[PDB]
Design a protein around this ligand. Sequence first.
Ligand SMILES: *[C@@H](C)[C@H]1/C(=C/c2[nH]c(/C=C3N=C(/C=C4\NC(=O)C(CC)=C4C)C(C)=C\3CCC(=O)O)c(CCC(=O)O)c2C)NC(=O)[C@@H]1C
Lengths: 162, 162, 162, 162, 162, 162, 172, 172, 172, 172, 172, 172
Amino acid sequence: MKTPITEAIAAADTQGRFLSNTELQAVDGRFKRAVASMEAARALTNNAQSLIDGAAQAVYQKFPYTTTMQGSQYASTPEGKAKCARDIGYYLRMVTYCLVAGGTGPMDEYLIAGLSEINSTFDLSPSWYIEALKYIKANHGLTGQAAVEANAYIDYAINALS
Amino acid sequence: MKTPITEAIAAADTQGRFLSNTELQAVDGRFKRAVASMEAARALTNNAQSLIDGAAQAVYQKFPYTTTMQGSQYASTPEGKAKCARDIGYYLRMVTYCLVAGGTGPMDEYLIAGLSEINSTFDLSPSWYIEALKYIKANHGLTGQAAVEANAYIDYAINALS
Amino acid sequence: MKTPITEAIAAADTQGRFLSNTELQAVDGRFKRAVASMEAARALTNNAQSLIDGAAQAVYQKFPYTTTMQGSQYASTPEGKAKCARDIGYYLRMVTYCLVAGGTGPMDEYLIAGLSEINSTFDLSPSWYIEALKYIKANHGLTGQAAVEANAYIDYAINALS
Amino acid sequence: MKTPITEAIAAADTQGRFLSNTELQAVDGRFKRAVASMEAARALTNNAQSLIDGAAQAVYQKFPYTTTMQGSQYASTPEGKAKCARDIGYYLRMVTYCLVAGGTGPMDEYLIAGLSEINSTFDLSPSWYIEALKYIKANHGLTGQAAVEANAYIDYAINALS
Amino acid sequence: MKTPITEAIAAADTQGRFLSNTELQAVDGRFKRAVASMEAARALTNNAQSLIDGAAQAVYQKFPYTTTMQGSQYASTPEGKAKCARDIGYYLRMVTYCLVAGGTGPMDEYLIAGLSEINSTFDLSPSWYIEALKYIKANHGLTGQAAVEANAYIDYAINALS
Amino acid sequence: MKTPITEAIAAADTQGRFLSNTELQAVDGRFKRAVASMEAARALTNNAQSLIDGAAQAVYQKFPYTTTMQGSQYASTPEGKAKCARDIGYYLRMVTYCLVAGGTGPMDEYLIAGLSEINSTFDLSPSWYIEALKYIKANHGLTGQAAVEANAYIDYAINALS
Amino acid sequence: MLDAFAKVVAQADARGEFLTNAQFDALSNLVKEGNKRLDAVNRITSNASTIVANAARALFAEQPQLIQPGGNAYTNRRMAACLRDMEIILRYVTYAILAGDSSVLDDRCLNGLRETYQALGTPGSSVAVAIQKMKDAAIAIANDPNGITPGDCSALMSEIAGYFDRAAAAVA
Amino acid sequence: MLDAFAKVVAQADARGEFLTNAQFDALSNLVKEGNKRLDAVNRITSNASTIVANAARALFAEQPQLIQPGGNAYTNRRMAACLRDMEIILRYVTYAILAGDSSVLDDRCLNGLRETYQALGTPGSSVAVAIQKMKDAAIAIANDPNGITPGDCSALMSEIAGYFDRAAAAVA
Amino acid sequence: MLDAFAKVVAQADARGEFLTNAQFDALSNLVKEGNKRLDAVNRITSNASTIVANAARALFAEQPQLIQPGGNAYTNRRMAACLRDMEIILRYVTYAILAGDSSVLDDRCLNGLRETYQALGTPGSSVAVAIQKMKDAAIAIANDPNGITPGDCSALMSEIAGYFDRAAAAVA
Amino acid sequence: MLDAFAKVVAQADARGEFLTNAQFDALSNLVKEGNKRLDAVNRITSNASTIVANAARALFAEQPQLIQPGGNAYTNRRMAACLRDMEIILRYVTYAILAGDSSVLDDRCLNGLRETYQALGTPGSSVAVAIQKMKDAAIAIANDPNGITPGDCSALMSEIAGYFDRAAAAVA
Amino acid sequence: MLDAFAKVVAQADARGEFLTNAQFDALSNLVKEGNKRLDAVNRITSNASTIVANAARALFAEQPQLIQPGGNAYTNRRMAACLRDMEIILRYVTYAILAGDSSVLDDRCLNGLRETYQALGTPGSSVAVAIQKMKDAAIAIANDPNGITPGDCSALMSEIAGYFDRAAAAVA
Amino acid sequence: MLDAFAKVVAQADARGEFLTNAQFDALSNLVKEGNKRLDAVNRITSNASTIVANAARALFAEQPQLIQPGGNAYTNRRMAACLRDMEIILRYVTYAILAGDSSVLDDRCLNGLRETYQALGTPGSSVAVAIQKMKDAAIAIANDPNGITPGDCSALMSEIAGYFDRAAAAVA
Ligand SMILES: *[C@@H](C)[C@H]1/C(=C/c2[nH]c(/C=C3N=C(/C=C4\NC(=O)C(CC)=C4C)C(C)=C\3CCC(=O)O)c(CCC(=O)O)c2C)NC(=O)[C@@H]1C
């Protein structure tokens, strides 16, 4: 999994070298940033449910057809709505994994790999999940560098869907 | 050249990716460490001459034969002594390059690549340069994290010679 | 370009061989089928405009939001509608290229290569173009083996979008 | 084995694709040609013995030395003659395999691969087998497209020996 | 060209090494053998014409059909006979090149490479040239180690034709 | 192991060929040289002890510091002296292996591979072993071609250390 | 790779025999059924994506633990891998339908596939369910009496079923 | 690689146009001449070895310096290389006859071939003679009125000649 | 690859000199501006997709012949290639912003790129327009005064502009 | 490869769960001990060569049959291979110290290493001795109270010992 | 690869010993027999093709089921493969004769060859017959008293037989 | 690669001629001088390292700007590269001495080497000085009258000089 620390080791291991100051400086930056990253992960976790519930509605309001249109890919049934809230929660949970791990690795491995294939096969529009992420970014209530961490990984998701 | 920043870019460029928070945390650690690294580079530069002069003698005292033994590889002639002081200064100057660049790149590219070949061809014993570096490490007069930076790159040289 | 004839040559050329009866039988099947393929290409070309106009509406009726929703990717403006009718015509024209060439080559090279990238970047939903192709398949008015040829390449487009 | 159908599949399988109309047109040409191919295979099989007996003599008349010259590679002994008639029958049987399979695969795999090595090691002259095949081509009594199929694979053998 | 000396260099050059005693011993064996090799080359050159004339007849006697049978590949015409005597002389001249060079290189490069292709295309039977070489081997009149050298390269030709 | 004979076979085996006169001439040169090579190997073996004892002193006289200087890499202790005499004997024994085998293989495989790594890790100066070999070369008492063989492999060791 | 024709050829060659009349007649009836064979391949292939998608949608409805956290088909990487395996199996099955012989499916798809799923933790019994779904869908589509010249394709649909069953039996 | 059909397609696409009737009729007449095209390919291909051999035998008779010591076709290595080049050229020409378009011959055979012979010392003017020999032989064989349904193949033989001339012009 | 720091090192080494105070002070001020540099990289990178898309949408509006049949950006293959080139250029520009030096952009992106577009028929003058669009968008985004600690980043925005201009000048 | 943080992430994901407070607090205390972890890695790494050399010198003193003729570490090729294996093991151990997790050491060093030594004739019991020597030396060096801010690193030294023991147990 | 000389060297080294007189005398007698060894290699090699061909001709006479339809040596592909295996075995045997040691034959020819024939269906017992034929022919040729300096080569012919038997024993 | 013998062979073949007596006598005198040729190769090769080192030591004494900061031979990477080039040139020269022909040196060392040094900034005029130094040293060593059977090697030393001059002329 791609974290600042596994990148440091990967770099050294690729060249057949012991670690050096070059790499330890990189891990120190991960350890220092961790303060702001944890603060964000803890806040997003504590407010996860209202953020998922809020994000799901932002989608249904932006894209009303997804609640009235017939089809197993839409949220026009109780099951559809459940699947959607489920997916939004998956995205939110991956953001907190990235904050805790200090990199994109968790989202890369668990969500982004295969994403475009899944969205095509099941006829899921990326516009939906972008809007859900855009809503979380606006209403997570984070300030300072904690917001910068959170937005960096939410915007990372958004670029994967664009 | 191998610095914390070119490693960050190399990592991203290798995978065909934009930079991510994973990499920016690494550069932040380089920028934070720079305070201690610069302090050391400035001090080693300001006291370079007495350190070179002191280190050269530590060698001649440890290895007296290098001043009395006949041969173009020894410091038994004015030219030999000049070449030796020159080489010690090269090592000291590379340490300060590594501190300024934030990594081993300068020493790797300008000194370590080819080192063993050069020491074999011209019959230069690594024991000599280790002793010179050991002397600099003991008498650079650095405290705190500045000493840790300096010693990390001097000990890096020593491992290349061992 | 991938046609029954270039596949025959490619096969022989790959192995360093002259053509053989194995390959000539394949071209004969292309020449025999051409009767039905041409009939379809000529009919789809002769009725192209009403099919494009009909297909565009099937989309706007199936997906009404694409005509009322704000955004440069939707057909909520005269330009948007023009772009859409343009795209539907591109799909129809590729079907006739495939019928004339006797294979998928034209559509593969001019439309399918890059398709998923284009639909993601400009936020164009594949569901739209599938519905347009589904409408053309139902209302091209072709019978017998001419219909089988036409449907084979329209359904080929649909699988590329699924 | 190389048949029109395994070439179609090979082509698709090489590119990681389902079959397409491009390939099915090729198999249709194999299925249509099969009428003429079978007619030839059935006739060559029904008259195989007189064709083998006739072909063997055409050789001994064209190359009389092969019946009078001493050596295990010649037909100057009852065993030699048996081996020769055997070989001519092998060639005739491969022609009928190619007609039934619709391609060169049978002859390629069972006879042509290794042919030049075998003819060198055992001192068998290709001129002999060409003359035997030339005789079969002239006296198989086939007309129309059945003759075209038969001659295509007999001439295919001849080119392998030239 | 493959000689004992170019093999020695090739070996060293392949491994990135200076020559060593391992290789010089090999060249010494070439220089010592040269006495016997030259003696043979000089004798075969001095008696080349009677050997070519004798060898050509051994062929026509062994294979009488090659003088009476119609075809541009046979010696049934003045031109055919000229081509044959020419070819036999080519073989004899290559044997002397191998003796002078101390290896197979000359024959490998000028005659053996392409041999089987040429004999197939122009319908030239290897049995002919084997008989010509067999005659030269029996009537070159060489004794001792000179004969051993000559026979080693004539038998080398024969194996290339078998 | 690299001997004149395994090089001959290696050459043939690399190209997929039987041996040829090209290679047998090389082995003959090994068999002829063996006279002088054996004479040297037998003499160096018979006088090994006085040569080792003499060579060890040449080193301690040339490099007196190796007997007075503290450190496990020096001969300033009974164990150190034992290790040194041991190493000199290893070099002498490899020279006799090379003479018996007719090539560098024994020394290449048992001593040279890894040499520079070992001399660096244990802080053993190549100058020492060169002087020991230089002494053996001057006092082995060999004349004629036996001396040429011995010196070829001693100078081969010296180049590996330079 | 062998098709129905090369299959007979390779058996006659092993015996050193010309073909008999029983074989020339059997191979003629393949040809006479070739149109039907091409309709089936064309139909299954033109609906490849819906066959796969609908099969997966049903599989995950019936076995929702495959998509729960920890499930073998959880995360998009493993879901995509699963949908791919279903695409691949269907692709090699359509190859076999065109060839009249299972060798392509055996040699290039099914051989070693049981060992692959065992080494990965993938339940082949669930992959078999998936293959069963595709089968019923492919046969329903290929034997649809609509928009085609009426006739009897029952023997062909038995053959097509045979390949699906073969693949399903090789993973379980 | 383009055949006659893909050629028209790629021109219409560059213009963004459906095909006109003048194009649908022209492409139909190719199809109606397809049998003749297959007879020519089959005939030239079934006599590939005699076309090449007899062409070489004549070339070397007319230009015996190519086979004298020092000649570019002296030694069996260079003779084989020469016979091969003749095989290769003929092979790509028969490809073009089947495709109705020279692109395969141009892209995969003739492009850069003049520069190759110049860098090797091979006289392309003699290679052109060789290609001329094969041409006359291939046309004589392909247009043989014997053992075939009578008809007019003159336009096809002009096309076939066009490819041989094209190759001959590209090496000289 | 060189960053701003390695750049100075490599110049001092060429002279055989320790660093002077003018250099130790200059390299300290880079560090003191490092936060701003990371905000710019983060901001441009977090909006990579909208920077590219909106830039293309404007390019094709202004130059609609690039998307007409025959145009260099017509068909999805060439459109995707164009969008990719824009992604790639932007990616190497953000690399340069982090390094404080253009060497990565020069060595790995811009060197030889003019010759590439010339050999393909791509109008580099239109690629320059594209790069100009991204520039204005990236600077507007990176220098947005909102949601960040107030301060002066003008020197940094001049540097960022320098890289975009450099790339735009190398293709035209 | 997993570090201490990714380890927790991958366990929560398998359960489909957000992290609990017990996990957010545990991962915060890793960070708060990060300085100590970097001192240990730096110290062991800065003395890599003396750790290895002195360990070998002791190993061969205690087991002189490894360097006698016929011994597994006799000749410079096998001695160098032995010193290398010791370098490699130490390198992957320092990787694990930085990551807070043994996965890199397991996956890339220790897995299959027992089988390698068995197939070569190398006594893993002697390799374990070597690893034991390096361990005591590395801990003595890394926990040296001199020239560092005083504090308690005992838990870290237990962890570091754990990795050495793990490697030693995997070869024996 | 080891020759007779390197063999002794590698045994002395394993013991850490100089060579004794018993070894210097034994290695001198190899040299003194070197001419005979070169005559044998030269003779077998100069008749490689007749040794192989005549051996096969006899094998197939005695075991005609190997060449009947279905036989392992039926078809030209398998016949050529068989003749090749016979060429290869003979080639590695002549290598061993020159080296005075079987290691080249063992390591590069015979090792794993029994498993190869078992996995292919080739009867190694018939391959052994083939190797037996070549043996008698090679010895008859190599020990021919004609056209050579008279002398005793009996020990050499026993050695040569040893290699053939070794190969024959390794496939059966 | 050609040696002195293959050289004559390739000239006779181009003419289609047997060798004349003038050629059989010339090639016999090479053989009769073979011992001297082997002494020269052995002597130069046994002193390769001192030839190179002493040559470099003198080169850098005479041209100290090559080792000053900025010099082409400054840093250990470029010094090692320089010493290597000197090793390589000397190695290919000794090859030529053994072969009696410069082709190996030309084809595998000197061809394109002038262009290489020009593209790198290396002054070939200084490389020529280096080659001149090695030449004088190699000839002094190879023609040393000590410890060898007395005789005249002057023609050989002229040849050896010819190769050094050839290499020196090809870089300048
Ligand atoms: C110019 C681009 C605009 C601007 C930038 C700005 N930022 C600061 C302060 C900070 N910026 C960061 C950002 C990061 N540090 C990291 O390690 C990473 C990657 C993980 C990032 C993205 C931080 C941590 C700070 C310090 C904390 C803070 O919020 O201040 C300043 C003030 C100067 C300074 O360096 O501190 C400025 C000016 N502000 C503007 O008005 C410009 C439009």
